[PDB]
Amino acid sequence: PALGYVVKVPVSSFENKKVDISDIEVITNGNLDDVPYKANSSKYNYPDIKTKDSSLQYVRSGYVIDGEHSGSNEKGYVYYKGNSPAKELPVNQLLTYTGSWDFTSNANLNNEEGRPNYLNDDYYTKAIGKRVGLVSGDAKPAKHKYTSQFEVDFATKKMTGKLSDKEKTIYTVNADIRGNRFTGAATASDKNKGKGESYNFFSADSQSLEGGFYGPKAEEMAGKFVANDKSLFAVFSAKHN
Known part of the structure; x- marks a missing residue:
């Protein structure tokens, strides 16, 4: 595995x-x-x-x-x-996992795609996502903080959650728990790319969200997903309490 x-x-x-x-x-x-x-x-x-x-x-x-x-x-x-x-999973425990998520976008130099040339307030890089993919690491902490939230019901074998940017919800997650693994989907809160400085790198859904619980009593989790159109790859990890 x-x-x-x-x-x-x-x-x-x-x-x-x-x-x-x-x-x-x-x-x-x-x-x-x-x-x-x-x-x-x-x-x-x-x-x-x-x-x-x-x-x-x-x-x-x-x-x-x-x-x-x-x-x-x-x-x-x-x-x-x-x-x-x-190897042991707490049943009838309603665990909440808190952590972060990171990502890289695709690269798109096409001028019609309307990706911004300048957003110095937000990122340490210029020409956001044009020559090279936008990475979560590019963001300035003052303007962007990528946190993850996961609600896990081991009784009903169900996981829900949210991938957030500071305050804003970027993705909601849904997944089925199968043993120490989970599998499901990430749903983009904003479906429109927009244009210019308000370009949205997270417009695409994903049916390939999957990861696992790690540590004996499922103390932690981590996973990933890829946009259905390969425009984004995201990863995440979180601890419960």
Whole structure:
């Protein structure tokens, strides 16, 4: 069973202006300190690896990006991983999991797509999602905070939740629990891309939301989903209490 997944941020070109999410690799290394492709990150202008949440014992999600990206260079990777799949699951316990989520968009240089050239208030990067995919790591914490919320009913084998940006709800999640795994869908709260500085990178749904509970008594969870149109790849991890 796959311990996690890792995706490279899409990079577009002039006669390939639209490059979608692809090559979702399996992670066989379940060590939470081994960050996927960290050994390749030295060539980045600012090797930006998302902080490790030490309260998380079993799972980890985040990214490995060039935090000072330039032109058409490698942006980096988004991933999640978890070890010790749950073998005992609290039944009739109504658990609430709180954590984060991270993402990378596709790349789309087509001018008609109407992705913004400048949003310095929001991100550390220019030409948002045009040459290279937008990553959650790009956002300035003052304007964007990607948190996850999950309501899990082990009695009814049902999970609901929300992927939020600061206050705003970006996705609602629904999933069926099958053992220590879950599978389901992410529903985009906003279906319209819009245009310009109000361009919406999260307009597409996803029928491929899946992850697992990790740690003996299902103390933690992590997972991922891909947009049905490959425009986004998201990961998440959360702890219950």
